[PDB]
Amino acid sequence: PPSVFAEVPQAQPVLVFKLTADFREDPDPRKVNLGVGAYRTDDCHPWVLPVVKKVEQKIANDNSLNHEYLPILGLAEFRSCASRLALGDDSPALKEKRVGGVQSLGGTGALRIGADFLARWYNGTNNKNTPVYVSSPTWENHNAVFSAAGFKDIRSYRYWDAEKRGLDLQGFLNDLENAPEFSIVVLHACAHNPTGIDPTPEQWKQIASVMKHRFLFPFFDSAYQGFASGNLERDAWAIRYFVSEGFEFFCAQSFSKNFGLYNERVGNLTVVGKEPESILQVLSQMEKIVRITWSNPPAQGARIVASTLSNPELFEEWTGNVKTMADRILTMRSELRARLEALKTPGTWNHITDQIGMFSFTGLNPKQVEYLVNEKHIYLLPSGRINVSGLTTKNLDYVATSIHEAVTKI
Amino acid sequence: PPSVFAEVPQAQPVLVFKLTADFREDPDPRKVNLGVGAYRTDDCHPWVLPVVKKVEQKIANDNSLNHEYLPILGLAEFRSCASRLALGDDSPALKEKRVGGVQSLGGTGALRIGADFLARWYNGTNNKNTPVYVSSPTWENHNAVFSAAGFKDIRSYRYWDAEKRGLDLQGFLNDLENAPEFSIVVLHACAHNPTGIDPTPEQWKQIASVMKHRFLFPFFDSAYQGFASGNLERDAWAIRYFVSEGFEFFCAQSFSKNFGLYNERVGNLTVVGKEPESILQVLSQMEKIVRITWSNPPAQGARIVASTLSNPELFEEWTGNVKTMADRILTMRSELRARLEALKTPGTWNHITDQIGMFSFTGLNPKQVEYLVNEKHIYLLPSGRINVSGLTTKNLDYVATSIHEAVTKI
Ligand SMILES: CC(C)=CCc1cc(/C=C2/OC(=O)C(c3ccc(O)c(CC=C(C)C)c3)=C2O)ccc1O
Numbered sequence A, B: 001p002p003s004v005f006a007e008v009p010q011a012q013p014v015l016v017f018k019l020t021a022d023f024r025e026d027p028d029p030r031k032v033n034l035g036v037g038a039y040r041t042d043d044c045h046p047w048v049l050p051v052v053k054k055v056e057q058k059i060a061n062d063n064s065l066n067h068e069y070l071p072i073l074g075l076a077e078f079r080s081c082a083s084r085l086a087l088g089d090d091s092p093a094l095k096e097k098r099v100g101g102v103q104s105l106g107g108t109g110a111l112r113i114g115a116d117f118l119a120r121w122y123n124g125t126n127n128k129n130t131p132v133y134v135s136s137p138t139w140e141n142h143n144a145v146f147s148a149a150g151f152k153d154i155r156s157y158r159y160w161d162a163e164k165r166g167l168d169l170q171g172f173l174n175d176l177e178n179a180p181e182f183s184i185v186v187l188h189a190c191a192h193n194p195t196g197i198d199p200t201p202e203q204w205k206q207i208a209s210v211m212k213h214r215f216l217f218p219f220f221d222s223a224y225q226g227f228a229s230g231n232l233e234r235d236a237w238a239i240r241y242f243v244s245e246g247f248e249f250f251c252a253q254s255f256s257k258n259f260g261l262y263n264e265r266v267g268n269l270t271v272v273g274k275e276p277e278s279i280l281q282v283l284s285q286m287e288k289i290v291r292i293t294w295s296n297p298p299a300q301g302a303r304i305v306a307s308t309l310s311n312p313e314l315f316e317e318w319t320g321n322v323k324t325m326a327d328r329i330l331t332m333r334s335e336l337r338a339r340l341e342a343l344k345t346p347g348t349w350n351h352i353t354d355q356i357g358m359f360s361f362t363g364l365n366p367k368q369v370e371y372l373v374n375e376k377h378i379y380l381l382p383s384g385r386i387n388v389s390g391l392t393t394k395n396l397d398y399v400a401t402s403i404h405e406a407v408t409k410i
């Protein structure tokens, strides 16, 4: 062919971006976009955290800062603060100094860096055959990230039960005890994307017990710590429980939501090891993978987080901005459930409030979604997931009535 | 109960990291560090460009900017001016709309995204066997970035002539004539790393002749445009010549040096093809590569470069800052050759001024380097490479006399 790129086709457009594209093209005056992948205020507007705007002003006014290369592993003060946020100041793994932190480009970078390491140094030398497990519907790119690291056997475990509209613990635990030993399990630390339903502490202890005696490697995805329920301790309970149980694991931390710094790509890959020497060996090889991916991480976003977490006055204001987004999400969840039960909508709806975080599995079948999209012009994925921050005091009456209508018919 | 990281070897530091580490531990007060990987002033300090401090203020005073996800490919205004800076305003490829741009994490990210694409869609699907050609002394991560993409045959072409201390034109062109067709050739667009010696335009016209006669894919590495010569049009002549000759190529752009934004990771992958439809399809397939690497690029660094290249008043302040760095390096080279020839040092030394950029091959053998490090405490690589910006007017007289001893005594 004349062009070198002639035999290359147009990539498959991701399903949620096509949803947003069709939304902004729908001329209906009652259109609702519940498929936005970020937090939106009650006025359908993005929200820059006031703590972020204040910290950014001081960074802009700080001549102590140059623009020289950060270390390969990233900004030190951000790395220690990010892992202390997930593990806690009183973590025994920190006192024993068996913790490492690689600054990442959001959670996606931490998942890629961790998967690249596992596909090279874990369960043998370049063992691409290690099974990797994901949830019923997981994050759309969990499969793609581990597939890019070379893993050739990506499996799924039961998580969300459509009929009970909740967690399928027996399907989860039986898929775990049937997994080959030393398999990697991708675990949502809190705020399950996209279901929103999380295991209880007494359910996590059962999930952890299976992975312990089968040597299943936990890979935590902590993308909404604090942002989900408004409590930093409760959102990190599963991570810290695995710490007390002596687990070795990676934990992909994201600060795009609890800080609202989506476009600055602030992430951390926390590593917990048996020995302090094992961490310096892991961080030794993380540098080689970073070097060939992004040579070193950006500084602006990580500087915002490190200043916020290490300063007690700005840490208090940040938690105030976090509870703002969590309480509004909590309010929108309860307002929708109250409206749906007031109209006498068939079926159970306590899962609307049992789930947490920004995303929620509404529990409707694909063709009930098409009614909401085509007839009522409420845009959501056929998966049945909505963005709770997409609900407002203005559209709650129209959305709740439409969901009622979608379940009346069909 | 051993650890899963128990057999992970402790990775050793790179040679450049050990050189700086040994330097700041050296107690001799005459020590000169010529191995810093960034621009340094006459006072051995980093330099934040004055236009960058001003643009950082304007961005902080812009309450309109949010922190929502940039497009997968990046900020459109940055990709607009980044590629426009490399190809020229009145470039035919731009007015014919056959140019694409991917915002990347520095030039290293642009190389990685480009290498990942070529390993999947170039010269067949998933062809990991297309030979990749690099300079015989090359930037070390070139082999590492393309190896991480999966290319199993990384080749070298003759470049640095140690005896004549210049460019081996006949060794370069001979290795390209014997290169297998459709082979990828990584080309330094300007200021070769680490030699600093560049092909003349008439030398570039012979390189482009062989690459066209054998369908060799050019992967340009433009990491010092403006920073090297002070002239943006001269530093991009080879790239713009390949456009006029009808080449399809990649060009990994870096803004770490000409803007001094090392730790903001500002890069761009310029794609030049024959048909505009294929270019869009290439950018789509690169979105899938990006979103599994870093989900989307950061905003701060790209905003700084975009505001600078978009506003004409800020554009000249930048070229004035660029001229300062290029002129100081030009003067440091000129005085180094002057003192060396004044001291009647054996051999030719016009290569110090014939080279361009802040990296120079001094023409010393590894044992002449050992004398400089051991007996004179001047820290440079065994290759003989020095950072010319590590030379100051207060140590230049001591370095030139030190180089004179090493060649007369060893
Ligand atoms: C500083 C530059 C741009 C050097 C030359 C150059 C750059 C690129 C692309 C890059 O973009 C970047 O940001 C970095 C980067 C990141 C970490 C780092 O330690 C160094 C220092 C390495 C040196 C100075 C040899 C550079 C790149 O390595 C491709 C080819 C090149 O020859």
Ligand SMILES: Cc1ncc(COP(=O)(O)O)c(C=O)c1O
Binding pocket: A105, A106, A107, A108, A109, A139, A192, A193, A221, A223, A254, A255, A256, A257, A265, A266, A267, B295
């Ligand atoms: C479950 C999950 N994992 C990973 C990510 C990636 O986050 P980031 O954009 O910061 O990389 C997201 C989004 O926050 C997510 O929801």
